[PDB]
Ligand binder design. Structure first.
Ligand SMILES: *[C@@H]1O[C@H](CO)[C@@H](O)[C@H](O)[C@@H]1O
Ligand SMILES: *[C@@H]1O[C@@H](C)[C@@H](O)[C@@H](O)[C@@H]1O
Length: 61
């Protein structure tokens, strides 16, 4: 199967704007012919999670 057939969504808003926040995206999947036929469920990665804004929040006096 071609996993790139079903496009990924956009990276969501960073949970924490600083101090190592997290964000995630996922493929856009609608149940149809190509999906069930080509076994796109088992051999494809449907999610990608990443840490965002790992720079420490500025410490002010
Ligand atoms: C994951 O989704 C992104 C969004 O368009 C593409 O760049 C990529 O080819 C993949 O299928
Ligand atoms: C989010 O964004 C960064 C740039 C800082 O201003 C932080 O104070 C805030 O939590």
């Amino acid at each position: 199967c071609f996993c790139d057939h079903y496009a990924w969504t956009q990276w969501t808003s960073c949970s924490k704007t600083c101090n190592s926040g997290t964000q995630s995206r996922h493929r856009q999947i609608v149940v149809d012919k190509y999906y069930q036929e080509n076994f796109c469920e088992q051999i494809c990665s449907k999610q990608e999670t990443r840490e965002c804004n790992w720079q420490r929040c500025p410490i002010n006096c």
